[PDB]
Design a binder for this molecule. Structure first.
Ligand SMILES: Nc1ccn([C@H]2C[C@H](O)[C@@H](COP(=O)(O)OP(=O)(O)OP(=O)(O)O)O2)c(=O)n1
Ligand SMILES: [Mn+2]
Ligand SMILES: [Mn+2]
Ligand SMILES: [Mn+2]
Ligand SMILES: [Mn+2]
Length: 438
DNA sequence: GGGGTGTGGTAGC
DNA sequence: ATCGCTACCACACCCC
């Protein structure tokens, strides 16, 4: 048990934070792509016809945590009991629930108390601990399998549990659905054996947006092949609005009142005009949502195939800590700001870059929000503020960066005990070259 | 036109 | 108890 003002707080919070493990796994996957394909150039051109295999583990954490469960859960049955991965018993986020749990309508992200209340009496929720190293190991088996199979020209990290895999079809050869239906089976089986029992689902299409939607139609433990020539009302009607890329809870809300509450992608499909759509959710987002409702990708999304190196290169670096923030005085806020900058400088140095620009974001307790929110150590309800500072010459100096960071907090005006959350960023990054003379 | 900003949206949760 | 993390783009304005 470690308070925010203990020198050890950052290391411990990161050791238990599944969100931190997720972002770091993500980040390490993107660097290994940039080292593996440093002199390879098997990227996607417009001269290429390609198919997208979008591959993802079914209830990833839930599965790995069950497969590696301690002897205390030996009798747990993974297709018979609702299983969640979580820290706690009340206001603890469910990082992953199995599909037994999803029948009762439990979702990823809910709290244990909120998922328990949806089970009928006589049904027990099972809560497995996080198994972070096993998550990492299993993922490694997944990416090793994909590359070993020798059937993709580009393998794109999406996640600890996801990749977009591109196969180029030479125009001599002729692709068919039984050929496709059957790479899927090879992939699913090979990953199953390699992961010692984890299952993946695959969506397969001539577009990223259709492979994403197909992947969702395929889950659990299955695969869906849906090309643009296969589109039907039956397809669109099997999706809700935020199933679509580019649609989070706010865009979703905006669409639901500009178009008389569409309930399936088919509804939205038949009721929308491009121009009312732009005016409702924003023009660029609206042109992507319009493209997506036809199965076609956007130019912003296609870049990941044409220059995946430029897309997956890290253009900023940052930490976020919005849990357990309870400082009493400014001296403690500064020391923790200092310990954050040193951690970020460690990351900046491992990648041999400087930063031109930093940013501090913070969360401040809303004036009438309780000082302790329902969630233990939660941020509670907060307004956020941020400020940025452009540094003269790019640097990796702790003196300069930490001092400007503490000044950006001194400037935002937030009393130490109203602090509930901190974010520390390095924005513009420069590679350190061989010349360093003025 | 270019450059900047803080806020807010999506994505991967 | 409980561990609410990162990275990118879009936008509405301001500057020269
Ligand atoms: N709100 C969330 C969503 C996901 N995760 C973690 C746990 C997941 O196991 C992992 C992968 O995310 P996915 O979106 O792929 O969800 P799942 O793999 O758990 O289930 P599925 O993809 O079959 O729907 O990310 C989390 O911690 N909090
Ligand atoms: Mn998954
Ligand atoms: Mn996933
Ligand atoms: Mn959505
Ligand atoms: Mn997901």
């Amino acid at each position: 048990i470690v308070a925010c003002d203990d020198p050890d707080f950052l290391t411990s919070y990161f050791a238990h934070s599944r969100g931190h493990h997720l972002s770091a796994w993500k980040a390490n996957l993107k660097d290994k792509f940039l080292n593996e394909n440093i002199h390879k150039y098997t990227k996607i051109t417009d001269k290429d016809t390609y198919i997208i295999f979008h591959i993802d583990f079914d209830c990833f954490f839930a599965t790995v945590a069950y497969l590696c469960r301690s002897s205390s859960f030996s009798a747990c049955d993974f297709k018979r009991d609702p299983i969640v991965v979580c820290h706690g018993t009340k206001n603890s986020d469910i990082a992953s629930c199995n599909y037994v749990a999803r029948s009762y309508g439990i979702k990823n992200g809910m709290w244990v108390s909120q998922a328990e209340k949806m089970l009928p009496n006589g049904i027990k929720l099972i809560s497995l601990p996080y198994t972070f190293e096993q998550f990492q190991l299993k993922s490694e088996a997944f990416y090793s399998t994909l590359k070993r199979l020798n059937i993709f020209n580009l393998i794109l990290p999406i996640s600890i549990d996801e990749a977009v895999c591109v196969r180029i079809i030479p125009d001599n050869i002729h692709n068919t659905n039984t050929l496709n239906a059957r790479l899927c089976e090879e992939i699913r089986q090979e990953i199953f054996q390699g992961t010692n029992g984890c299952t993946v689902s695959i969506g397969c299409s001539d577009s990223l947006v259709l492979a994403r939607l197909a992947l969702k139609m395929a889950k659990p433990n299955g695969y869906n092949i849906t090309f643009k020539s296969n589109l039907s009302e039956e397809f669109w009607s099997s999706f809700k609005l935020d199933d679509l890329p580019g649609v989070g809870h706010s865009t979703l809300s905006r669409l639901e009142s500009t178009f008389d509450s569409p309930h399936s992608l088919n509804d939205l499909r038949k009721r929308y005009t491009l121009d009312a759509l732009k005016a409702s959710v924003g023009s660029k987002l609206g042109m992507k949502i319009h493209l997506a409702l036809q199965g076609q990708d956007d130019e912003e999304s296609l870049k990941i195939l044409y220059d995946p190196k430029e897309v997956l290169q890290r253009k900023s670096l940052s930490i976020d800590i919005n849990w357990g923030i309870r400082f009493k005085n400014i001296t403690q806020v500064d020391l923790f700001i200092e310990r954050g900058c040193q951690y970020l400088l460690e990351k900046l140095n491992e990648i041999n870059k400087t930063t031109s620009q930093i940013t501090l974001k913070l969360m401040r307790r809303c004036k009438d929000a309780p000082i302790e929110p329902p969630k233990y150590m939660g941020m509670g309800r907060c307004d956020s503020f941020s400020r940025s500072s452009r540094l003269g010459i790019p640097t990796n100096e702790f003196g300069i960066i930490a001092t400007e960071m503490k000044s950006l907090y001194r400037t935002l005006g937030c009393p130490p005990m109203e602090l509930r959350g901190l974010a520390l960023q390095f924005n513009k990054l420069v590679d350190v070259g061989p010349d360093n003379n003025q």
